[PDB]
Symmetry: C4
C-alpha cells in the first residue's frame, strides 16, 4: 500500500506518460534547487522535549483569519487533468473535506465555476497571472470574488517560464480549458488593491529586500517559494530562505512556504522557523494520479497524521507551541 508521500511519487510515475511525469517534475536547467529543497530540510536537526503531557495534540491553525484542520494546504499547480480526468474538481472536493486551503491555479483544466460547483463550501484562494489587459484582470478578480474565493495569490517568480530541459527534449504537446500554446511590477500592485477587497498574497519571495518591498506595498501575506526549482535554478532552498524573510517581516504579516515538504517534520520545521503554514505542490498531483479525489485526500491525511505524530513526539501540544527552540542552531 501507499503509506507516505514518497510512495505516491513512485506510484504516480507509472500511471503517467513520461511526457506528463517530466512536466510534473520539470526541474529547471541543472536541477540543483529541486533536490536542494529536500536536502535543506533533511539537514536541520530537531531538539525534542519529552515527558510533557501530550494526550491532546491540536493540529489546527488559521491563515488570514480562516481556520483550517492543519497548516497543510494546496499550492497552485496547473492542469490537474494530466493526472486525473476530474482534474481540479477532485482536488476541490478533497480539499473541502480535509478543511484546508486550496489555491487554484490560473491555468486549471476546468473553469472556476465548475470547480467551485464541485465543492461549494471549500476554503480557497485564487492564483492569477496578471496580464497587460487589465480589463481581463479586474474581471477575473471580480469573477473570483463572486465565486467565493477568499484571497488572491500573485506569483512573482514567473515573469517568463523556467527552462525545463525535459519538456523541451519531449517537445511539449501537453495532452491531458485548453492548454496555452509579463511586465507586472511593484507599482502595478497599487492598482490591483484598488479593484479588489481580497487580501493579496505574494508568492515567490526569497529575499529580505523583496520582503520589505512587500510590506511597503501593504500586501496581506507572503509565500516563500522558489517555484519548486522550476524557474530560476540555483537559488536558496525555500526552507532556508524562510529564515531571512521571517526575520525581516517581524510578524507584521503571515509568512508561508512551499517547496520540498514531504514528511511531517518538514511541516514542523517550517512552523518552528516562523511559517504560518506550508503548501504542497507536486504531492497533490501524485495523489490525483494515483487515486483521484481519494488520492489527494490520502496525501493530506497522511501528512497531517505525521505532523500530529512529530508534534506529539517533540513535545508540542499545539501549533502555537512549535517554536525555534525545537531547531538546532
Amino acid at each position: 500500500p501507499l503509506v507516505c508521500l514518497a510512495d505516491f511519487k513512485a506510484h504516480a510515475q507509472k500511471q503517467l506518460s513520461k511526457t506528463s511525469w517530466d512536466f510534473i517534475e520539470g526541474e529547471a536547467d541543472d536541477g540543483i534547487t529541486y533536490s536542494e529543497n529536500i536536502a535543506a530540510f533533511k539537514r536541520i536537526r530537531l531538539r525534542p522535549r519529552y515527558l510533557r503531557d501530550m494526550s491532546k495534540v491540536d493540529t489546527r491553525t488559521t491563515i488570514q483569519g480562516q481556520e483550517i484542520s492543519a497548516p497543510i494546504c494546496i499550492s497552485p499547480t496547473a492542469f490537474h487533468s494530466i493526472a486525473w480526468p476530474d482534474g481540479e474538481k477532485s482536488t476541490a472536493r478533497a480539499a473541502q473535506e480535509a478543511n484546508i486551503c486550496y489555491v487554484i491555479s490560473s491555468y486549471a483544466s476546468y473553469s472556476l465555476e465548475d470547480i467551485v460547483a464541485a465543492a461549494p463550501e471549500g476554503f480557497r484562494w485564487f492564483q492569477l497571472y496578471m496580464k497587460s489587459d487589465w480589463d481581463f484582470n479586474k474581471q477575473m478578480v471580480q469573477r473570483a470574488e463572486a465565486l467565493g474565493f477568499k484571497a488572491l495569490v500573485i506569483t512573482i517568480d514567473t515573469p517568463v517560464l523556467g527552462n525545463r530541459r525535459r519538456d523541451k527534449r519531449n517537445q511539449l504537446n501537453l495532452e491531458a480549458l485548453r492548454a496555452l500554446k509579463a511586465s507586472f511590477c511593484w507599482n502595478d500592485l497599487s492598482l490591483l488593491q484598488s479593484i479588489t477587497r481580497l487580501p493579496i498574497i505574494l508568492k515567490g519571495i526569497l529575499t529580505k529586500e523583496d520582503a520589505e518591498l512587500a510590506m511597503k506595498h501593504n500586501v496581506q501575506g507572503i509565500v516563500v517559494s522558489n517555484h519548486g526549482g522550476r524557474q530560476l535554478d540555483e537559488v536558496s532552498a525555500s526552507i532556508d530562505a524562510l529564515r531571512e524573510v521571517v526575520a525581516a517581516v517581524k510578524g507584521k504579516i503571515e509568512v508561508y512556504m512551499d517547496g520540498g515538504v514531504r514528511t511531517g517534520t518538514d511541516v514542523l520545521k517550517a512552523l518552528a522557523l516562523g511559517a504560518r503554514c506550508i503548501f504542497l505542490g507536486r504531492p497533490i498531483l501524485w495523489g490525483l494520479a494515483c487515486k483521484g479525489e481519494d488520492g489527494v485526500k490520502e496525501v493530506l491525511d497522511i501528512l497531517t497524521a505525521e505532523l500530529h505524530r512529530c508534534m506529539t513526539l517533540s513535545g508540542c501540544q499545539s501549533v502555537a507551541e512549535i517554536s525555534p527552540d525545537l531547531i538546532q542552531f
Copy 2:
C-alpha cells in the same frame, strides 16, 4: 566466518523474513537519524598516545555501583523470539556469562520469571512502559524488585510509536514465544515523583537528547540517563546520539552517570562514547543480529567481539584502563 558486528548484520538478514528484518531495522520516516547515528561516530578523529606501557589493559568498570566486564551492555529490545526461538532466555544466559548488564524490554517474548530462571545470577535492569493504572504499575515494579532487577528504565521518547514505513507497507503481522504481541501515553515529569515515591529501585531515564531535559532529570533526582534517539525508530531527524551525548554530559557535570546507545558497532565507537563522558554504552540491534545468527552463542560472540575491539583500540590509543579514557583522545 563472522568476524565483526557488520558480519552479524549481513548474515542476520538472511535467516529472517523481510517482515522481521524490516521490523528490526525500522527506521522512522525518511530514516535520517538511523544512518546519522553511525556517520556521527565515523566523523570523530582519535588522537592516540604511543609508547606507554600497555601490557595490562583493564576493560572493567561499574554502573550504578555494579561491576561489569566492559562498558558494553544490552539495551532494551522487544520480542527476541523473532530472531531466535529461545528469545530473551538465550539473551539472558549470554549476558550473564559475559557479565554485563541486560536491560529487559517491557515487551519481551517470555515472562520475566522464565527469563530470570534461565540465568539466575545475571545483572539486569527492567525497562517498563508506564500505563494509566497506578496499580498495574506498582505491581509490575514490585514484581520486578521481587525478581532481582537492580534498576528501572523509563523510556521517555515513545509517547506514541514512530512511523516505520516498512512495517506499514508490510502491514505488520509480527509472527514470532508466549506473551503475545500487543496488536497496537500521557506520562509526564510529575508522574515520576509519584513513581519514585512508590519504588526504591534506581531510575534511569532513556531517550534524553537535550540539556534542558537533562536538567529536569536531575531536578527530579533520577539515578541515571541513557542518551538515545531510540535508534532512529521514533522522532527522526534529531541529533545523532553520540553528538547529543556532549551537551547532556556537559549539563550533568558528573552528578549522575550518563550512558548512550545508537550506532555502536565497533571498538572505537565504545572508546569515543567513554572519552566523551559516557559511563558505558548499550547495544540495540547487534544483540538481535547475534540471536538471529547463533542464538545464545551469537549474542555472546557479539559481546566478546566488541569487547575484544575495545581492548584493542584502548591498547593502541594508550589507555590502560577505562579511567584513562579521556576527551584528550578526541580531536576538537
Copy 3:
C-alpha cells in the same frame, strides 16, 4: 533534440573515437579540478529580485572596447579538425554570425589565413605560444596584426604539458599536429614589438594578478586550463574572486572553466568578470553539427543568460552585481 550544452556533450562523445574524446576531456592526473570547475559553480546561491520591469533585457557588453552580442566567447582550443572536417573555419563563421569574440588557438588545424578568409568580419583574438627565436615570435605577431586580430592572448599556465593519463594510455596518435622558458621580463619585450593589447590567460592568484598589472597588460583570463594542466588548484570561478579583488577594476578580468549554463555566466559577471569564454562546449558543438553546432551552443547559452537575467531582475549586463550572490 539537443536543448542544452550537456546534451551536446553526451552526443559529441558518440561521433568521436575514444582517442579524440579523451583528448577533449583530458583531465590531468587525478582529475580533481576538472570536476571542481563545475561543482564550484553549482554551490553558489543566487538572490533574485522580483517585480522589476524586465520587458527589455539587454545581453550586450564590450571587451577591450569591442561590442559583442553577449559576455559569451570562445576560449582557445587546439585542432578543431578532430571534431569536424572544416575545423576552425566552421567555428570562425559561427562566431562571426553570433557576433562574439573567437580566440584562435596557436595549434589550429587550418592556417590563420584560411580561417580569416572563411569569416572576414569576425571579431577575433590570437593565442600565441611564445618560442625562443624572437624573429618567429615577432613575425607571428605582425602576421596576426596584418590579419585583423584585435588582441594577443598569452597562456601562462602551460610551460610544460599537463599529465593526461587517458592520452598516455591511448598512446596519443592524434589523427584528425606537433609530435617553455617564458617569464615576466619577456613580457616587456613582446610589448615593444606589438601594439595589440595583451591578455594573460591562466592567472589563478592575486600575486600573479599584481605582477600582471605591474607589467601593464590589458586583460586577464582567470583560468586553470580546464583542469588539463596543474591539477588540484582552485576552481576558476573561485579563483575569480581574489583576482578581481586585487585588480580593483584597473583592467578587464575574464574567466573560463566549467561554464555550461546561463546562471554560470550570470555568476561570473556578478563576481566581477567582464565576460566568460567557452572551451570544450565549442568542440562539442562542432562534433555534433559543425558550424551550426557551434552557433547553437552559443545561442543556447545566450538564451539562458537572457532568461536568468530576466528571472533574477537584471535588465542589462551592467545591472548584474554581487548583491545577486549569497555570501
Copy 4:
C-alpha cells in the same frame, strides 16, 4: 600500459590471490583512515606561481645528511615475496638504481645479508620491532650496523596488530622466500634510552600523529619522525597522515627532520607534503604494486613515475628546487 601508480594498483590486484591482495590492502576495522589518507590530500588546493624561469628543476634533497634523487622513498613493508619471488632483493636493486632510501622491514622474506648482497651500494634504513629479549635486540642492531644500514626505524603504532577484517574472514594462511612468516609488545619511551646505549645509528620514530608525542620524541633526542598512521592498518579513525603532518611540523619547529607516508600516489601529493614541512615522503603499498606487476622493473617504474610527476608539478607551480617548495603554495 601502466602510466601512473593507480594503474599499478589495478594491475597488481590481478597477479595476486585475494588472500595476498587483501593483506596488502588490510584496512583496519571500518577502514575509515585508509580512504581518508587519500581524500585528505585531494582536498588541499594549490596556488601556482607562473612565468618564472623553470628551465632547470632540481628534485634532489637530503635526509639525515644523505643525498637522494627525490624526496620519494620506500617505507617498511613486510614479506615482499608475496608480490614477487625475488622479494626484497628486487626492491633493493630498484631502490639503489633510483638512488633513494629503502627502509627494510623487520619481517622481510629474505635475510638482511641476502638483501644487502643484491644491492651493495644501496642507501637503506632498518625498521626493527623491538622484543622482550634485548640480546636479540642489540645483536640485530649490531648486525644492521655491520651490514651498512644508516638508520634505525622504530615503529611505535603497532604494540599489537590492527584488526584487519579481511585477513580474518580469509583466515590468514600467508603463503608466499625463506625467512618464514611468523604465525603471529611492551616497548615504551624509557626503553628508548636502553636502545640508544647499544647503538650510535640515528633513530627515526615512525607512527607519530600528535604534537604531544612529537614533543616526547624530541625530549628523548631521536633524529627524525615519520608522521604516519600505518596506512590505516592499525588504529582506525585517526587523522589522515597529511593532516597530522601540520601539528607535528609546528611542534618540532625544524629541530629534527619530519617525514610522512600514507596515501601518497601522485606528484602533487609529494609536493603538498614538502610544502607543509615534510623533508620527504615514503611509499608503502605502491612499492608492492610495482613488485607484483614487473618485479624490480615494476618498483623502479613506480619510483620514476612519481619522480617525473613531482618534477612536473614543481615546474607548473613555479618551484625550481625542493628548497623553493613553501607553504605559500597551500591554500589556507
